[PDB]
Design a protein around this ligand. Structure first.
Ligand SMILES: C[C@H]1O[C@@H]([C@H](NC(=O)[C@@H](N)Cc2ccc(O)cc2)C(=O)O)[C@H](O)[C@@H](O)[C@H]1O
Ligand SMILES: C[C@H]1O[C@@H]([C@H](NC(=O)[C@@H](N)Cc2ccc(O)cc2)C(=O)O)[C@H](O)[C@@H](O)[C@H]1O
Lengths: 323, 323
């Protein structure tokens, strides 16, 4: 029937794929379990973390099961992917604090607590049980150094002295994928494009440990602004989902101020509006751009999803007053 | 009619776009001139440079005009985009040598020398005529430092002491786009995803210098291998297009050895085969994978395009003998 795949491609939500036909066939023949993870490096998520998780909700709409992973264990280490400098280690108590904040935001994006619906996992639960010796004998023997060395995600830090610990992070993410595959039949891992290396490590580790070849990876596009500026950065800094760090008004204003060149693409990325309504908004944008109907709709949909009706209205007021 | 755009999306050749609707309308309403550039940092191109240029040939097939730019001037500086370390400056004579090698390879991919067909330009021709003072008064006054600072392409080097010269490279690429827009009516610049920053600089510079708002940018996807390994790297190092650095046999073997998960996508990226023939090859791959029809076809098409019939046949022989 390919309804979901066609929806995803119309929205431009799929960037890299480990096996295009394989994934499409999988999605057409069965109900799939998939996951996306987030490390607790701050006590809130920001809009840059939003697209992959909303995309998991689009899969859920078609009968698939999403798994949201919080990196209680990997967050004690730090992902080097795409970054250029070694990150400082966080304290156990700060990570605990962060997990608590990010967890609350996840409960607002997915409905956890149901018998067979969305699931929230913390990788500290299994990674914290692994000893150094069993890690080297059970998993490390199945990873090649050259394989790890010839990868995108770490050349950036290769040139500037990557530590052995940042170098092994990719294997921890790999262990997570194998664990959810065996425990919850997870067959697909989703993530932003900077995660391509960590995602393929999981697939190759499973292939080497068990000849398991029914696992795939998908990445979501890096979100761009037509002028080339970084998306997700407001006047001060990042646009947080925590109302205490970025107020509903600031959040709402971020959306209402997107350009005409990017607004339709963002309606496709961030809202659950149908194609008919979105096409109507595109015509309105072409015919009556001064009405900003597209931006207004975008701001309302996302602000309500993240902060609720009440906060939206108060943001709509402060906005009418400021100008 | 949107025939070209539909072909491009079926092949998965478009990643980032500055204005999706704008581009589509432009391509439907007129014959467009577009360009892609390459800096002479080696005396040969490698397969990593291939996709954007072949994609320019697909546009040409539909009546558009491609411009190929060789960076005789920017190559004296070095693009910092995506890289993590300052590059050493090359000598004028080495750059001259490189321009000569890369130029020959371009004459084999496009048909230059016609009245209104493909054009080969060297940016040293106009950048070499700019003095320091006129550069600051004519162009520099129209670029904002914050704008430049809040960009992807250089955070990687921002953390490790980017020089002022690497920091200004993006403006040189911007000047090139404005120059080809005014001189050859160039309206679209194409490039790999690492060029998104340099491409948008051109568009914003034109917008600030002349309120010119009929220019767009398109990036081609980073080519991935299903296992996550870097594409375009053979046993030793990079896969060059120069027969003296990578023999036709080595080139041919690179293609014939691609996995079943990536072969169809590569036929769509690198060949001019139609959808019907490609779909037939996909069925053959699913039904009789041991025949490697898809890989064989891929290797033949690209090796012939790059090295010619004679070299192909000799590679087909050495290949039958080695195994
Ligand atoms: C949800 C977003 O998470 C971002 C980022 N993610 C990571 O660091 C991941 N390594 C988290 C992770 C940890 C363990 C896993 O098994 C799977 C994923 C973060 O801030 O937590 C990605 O950089 C982005 O591409 C997108 O995936
Ligand atoms: C053709 C390929 O060129 C690669 C790379 N390109 C560059 O460095 C560009 N800055 C070249 C360039 C120089 C001047 C321009 O006006 C426009 C483009 C190279 O090796 O020359 C890109 O990294 C890749 O994404 C793809 O665009």
């Amino acid at each position: 029937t390919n309804v979901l795949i066609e929806d995803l491609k119309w929205r431009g939500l799929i960037y890299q794929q480990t096996d295009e036909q394989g994934i499409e066939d999988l999605l057409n023949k069965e109900q799939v379990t998939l996951y996306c993870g987030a490390d607790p490096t701050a006590d809130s998520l920001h809009i840059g973390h939003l697209l992959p998780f909303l995309t998991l909700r689009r899969f859920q709409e078609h009968g698939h099961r999403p798994i949201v992973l919080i990196g209680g264990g990997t967050g004690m280490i730090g992902d080097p992917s795409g970054k250029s400098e070694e990150r400082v280690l966080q304290t156990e108590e700060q990570v605990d604090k962060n997990i608590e904040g990010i967890s609350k935001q996840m409960h607002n994006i997915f409905e956890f607590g149901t018998d067979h619906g969305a699931v929230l996992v913390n990788n500290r639960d299994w990674l914290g049980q692994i000893s150094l010796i069993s890690f080297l004998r059970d998993y490390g023997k199945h990873v090649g150094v050259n394989y790890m060395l010839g990868k995108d995600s770490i050349q950036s830090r290769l040139e500037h002295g990557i530590s052995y610990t940042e170098f092994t992070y990719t294997i921890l993410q790999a262990i997570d994928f194998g664990h959810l595959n065996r425990e919850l039949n997870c067959k697909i891992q989703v993530g932003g494009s900077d995660q391509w290396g960590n995602i393929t490590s999981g697939i190759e580790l499973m292939r080497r440990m068990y000849g398991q070849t029914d696992a795939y990876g998908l990445t979501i596009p890096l979100v761009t602004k037509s002028d080339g500026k970084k998306f997700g950065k407001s006047e001060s800094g990042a646009v947080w989902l925590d109302a205490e760090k970025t107020s509903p008004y600031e959040f709402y204003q971020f959306w209402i101020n997107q350009s005409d060149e990017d607004v339709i693409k963002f309606l496709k990325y961030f809202t659950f509006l149908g194609k008919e309504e979105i096409d109507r908004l595109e015509q309105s944008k072409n015919e009556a751009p001064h009405l900003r109907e597209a931006q207004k709709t975008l701001a309302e949909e996302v602000t309500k999803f993240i902060h609720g009706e009440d906060a939206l209205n108060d943001a709509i007021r402060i906005s009418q007053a400021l100008f």
